[model samples]
Target: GSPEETLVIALYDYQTNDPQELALRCDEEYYLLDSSEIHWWRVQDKNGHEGYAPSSYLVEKSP
Candidate 1:
């Protein structure tokens, strides 16, 4: 189901070799595609890449 999008930013650099995990750098804006859970949040990078990142690694962005 489609829902409102949440904007976020990575608090720290995240590097993952897992095919389903997303790699991210600090100071970049990203889009949240689903509700974040216990420790994982589904996010989409500006490059149109989508994957699961740690919820603790991301923070909500203001607009």
Candidate 2:
């Protein structure tokens, strides 16, 4: 596996009401876990919340 990438939330406003989903807020940063899925990504926020987040809202941060 490669170094974990930092993903920043870019959507103007985003939130997941699904209890099993990962909620991402604008300007928040999360650790990219798995991006194998085509449209969703497994990520973990700073609080340790882990779940699937929409790929479209996440932007990869340059190293």
Candidate 3:
């Protein structure tokens, strides 16, 4: 579900087995939900599967 949120792109593949983490595909689209945590940001893909993703693997798509 696309929303009026900061869009992000996965810089590299992040396939973590942690249940609390989200697997990110390189160059895939994502959304930034929360940044309260260091290094890990709450993000979601088009499917709205919210989870913690390492900020290092993401980049702001707009700027």
Candidate 4:
């Protein structure tokens, strides 16, 4: 089975502190690559940038 996709909320803008991470904006959607970490999860944005982001900023999209 494939991993589930995560959706970004419309409230916060996540600016990546590192060059390797994606800068996430509100209302944007992303795919969760891994969710093992507590603070940050590995994700890939629609633009194809991969990065680490705070899991609190994302939510499981409603089916």
Candidate 5:
């Protein structure tokens, strides 16, 4: 998975576990489905730092 998967919502609202003041601007994207065993999400930032987030926090939005 090279960061090309479905996007969704935040399971929690916080900065420590769930950082970033993600606005309701419907910020959608396609991230790499790294693994199915672990809830590991990788989001590549503009700074080139692949933001490895917790997939558990993501609830795949129904299209």
Candidate 6:
């Protein structure tokens, strides 16, 4: 929700078998426009045309 938080992902770990495989590395920070709105992050490759991923699916693995 308009939250400013830092998140990290340990690329290619067995525990996260269900998550969509990450193809591109995002150096720019992703921002959420809507505060409390339920939206999909729509994380795609460099093409920006891929599957839509629910924001809820993402978690704060680290601070």
Among all windows of ten consecutive residues in candidate 4, which has the lowest summed lDDT?
1-10
Candidate 4 steric clashes:
0
User: Best by TM-score, which number?
Assistant: 1
lDDT tens readout by residue for model 6, 1-63: 325543432232212223453332334223332224356443433345343344544533443
TM-score of 1: 0.80
Misplaced by over 4 Å in model 4 are 1-10
- Per-model TM values vs. the true structure: 0.80, 0.79, 0.78, 0.72, 0.42, 0.27
The root-mean-square deviation over C-alpha atoms between each candidate and the true structure, in angstroms, is: 3.3, 2.4, 3.4, 2.8, 5.8, 7.1
Pairs of residues clashing in candidate 5: 3-31, 3-32, 4-31, 4-32, 5-31
Candidate lDDT values, in order: 0.79, 0.75, 0.78, 0.69, 0.46, 0.37
Predictions ranked by TM-score, top down? 1, 2, 3, 4, 5, 6
Clash count for each candidate, listed in order shown: 0, 0, 0, 0, 5, 0
lDDT by residue (tens digit), candidate 5, 1-63: 324465555555523334432222134343444446365555543344344555666555545
Off by over 4 Å in 5: 1-4, 16-37, 44-50
- What is the lDDT for 9 in model 6? 28
Regions of candidate 2 where Cα sits further than 4 Å from its true position: 1-4
Better of 2 and 4 by TM-score: 2
Instruction: Give lDDT tens digits, candidate 4, residues 3-59.
Output: 454554424877878886668888777777677677777777667788777777777
- Candidates ranked, most accurate by lDDT first: 1, 3, 2, 4, 5, 6
Candidate 2: the clashing residue pairs are: none
Poorly placed runs, candidate 3 (over 4 Å): 1-4
- Per-residue lDDT value at 24 in model 3: 83
Q: Give the distance in Å from residue 33's predicted Cα in candidate 4 to where it truly belongs.
A: 1.0
Tens-digit lDDT string for candidate 2 (1-63): 236555656565778889878877777877777777778888887788988888787877755
lDDT of 1 by residue, 6-40 (tens): 78788887788898998888997788777647677
